[model samples]
Target: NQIDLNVTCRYAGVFHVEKNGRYSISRTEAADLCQAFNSTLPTMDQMKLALSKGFETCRYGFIEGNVVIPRIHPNAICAANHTGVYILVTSNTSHYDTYCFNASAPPEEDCTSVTDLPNSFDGPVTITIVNRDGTRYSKKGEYRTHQEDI
Candidate 1:
């Protein structure tokens, strides 16, 4: 497994944050808000349960002083669990460093009998990094998929 890029981070501590206030929630506050909806202080087990249910409640802060606009390339590295043929789709296209595997090697051309993958994959698929200068590299390994699992 190898990941190499010339990317930089200015708001590294956290680029996002969440609080339980009613007006401060974003669309992603679904599970976290649900967990603490009718409850008091959130418990560790509740936090664990929320995390298990795909709720990420991280606090954001600036890395040093200010936030820098990231320089993103146009192309992407794509792969599947098996190297034959598969349909790959991403729900979050704007977030390059993350991807979700919709299905692997659908039997039909338009996927008549598609098998639904778990919320996450069981193994490494493939990772390709393309630079802003139009250069690229590819590799595969066990990249960290679960932030809470970490």
Candidate 2:
């Protein structure tokens, strides 16, 4: 049986390791960087999963969640100031790497239909996805923008 665990980070090839091994990056910039690679910043849960899957890096990086947090594993020089399953730096004073992940999209079968909304549907729009089992999941927002040529 193939167990597909959608918890791996599709790391961008270039490691943004800092010179002093400690560099700072804003959460906004971090998100942009991940988008550049067609990915998004990983969540704390996803990061933990990566760690369990043998993903290791001595450097710390930002994970997306309430309040910016820098996550690192227990090491001789890293996270030495804290004791826990994973080290988290609560200070916003320092910059750190942005751990990114290109999580797999939801299963196609999970979504059976999409409502066709006009381009002029201003403001937010509601989208409902009906799963094979009749489970409906919905999202509300503008999915696209239309531009007219001059």
Candidate 3:
């Protein structure tokens, strides 16, 4: 299941939502902030995707596009002159919040191998098994050169 973007934003330290239902951050600087927190500024399509996935906010945010397109949910004060949908407010002088995409890390694999496994079993060797999470299991023992027939 997809993680909730609303909660994820809070988890990533994005607390400032709106001041008088408006924002004052630039697009580029907002992108950098998102990157610092292991995320990226959402593109126009990505923002729409979030909306489709039940992300609703009355605040405006910068979306990635060729021109400055501030994405805003339809509201009397925000997009009153436009259609009742997400409107684009293009202005270089204007500032707004940013919708960040949370890129989660890939899950680590299970336990792997020894530090240095010998090519030939000629002498005693120390074996170490490392878990994907970085925990290790090590054992020091002598390698048998010959096996006794039972």
Candidate 4:
């Protein structure tokens, strides 16, 4: 016998798991999906922690609060061109992938976070937004780029 002995090689980390397509699993089934991978559904903070560990996924995952979509690099298609762990309020009947938290997995050596964020447009920062169709618009008057609430 050359060799026929093996144990396990599990690692500690947070990873997303999906079926054939994104948003194909219900919230209830998402939990079981994580268990099937020998993990558990991560919480918001867990997702954030995973993001810090360089966990970037374009597809949405069913976290504890029903949302967790990481985006390391912003683009036209992914995360709407924003960099962060995006969250979306979904209905109970809605579906998404599963972000499993494997406590037994090996942690990343360089645990870091995205530090280069968009600059704060303060002072005379008249922002201009140009669409792909070449339509540009901007507020003539100077105003801090502030947007909150509906």
For every candidate, C-alpha RMSD to the true structure in Å: 20.8, 14.5, 20.2, 21.3
Q: Give the alpha-carbon lDDT of every model.
A: 0.25, 0.41, 0.40, 0.54
Top model number, lDDT = 4
Candidate 4, residues 12-129: lDDT per residue as tens digits?
3676655434356666666654564456788777767667767687777777876767877887787678777887654455766667776756675223221211222223434342
Q: Which residue pairs does candidate 3 place in steric collision?
A: none
Error of 4 at 133 (Å): 37
Error of 3 at 11 (Å): 13
| Residue-by-residue lDDT tens digits, candidate 3, 1-150 | 111111122222122222123465555555553553355666656555454443555556655552222223555664443322265645556667655555452222112322322222333434343332445444443222224300
TM-score of 1: 0.22
Candidate 1 lDDT over 1-150, as tens digits, reads: 332322111111111222211123222222222222221223333223333333222121111122111212222232322221112333332112211111222222221221211122234644343332445444453334335422
Q: What lDDT does candidate 1 reach at residue 53?
A: 33
**CA lDDT of 103 in candidate 1?**
21
Model 2 residue 107 lDDT score: 17
**Candidate order (TM-score):** 4, 2, 3, 1
In model 4, the worst 10-residue window by lDDT is 1-10
lDDT of 1 at 79: 34
TM-score of each: 0.22, 0.46, 0.45, 0.60
Clashes of each: 0, 3, 0, 4
Cand. 2 Cα-lDDT? 0.41
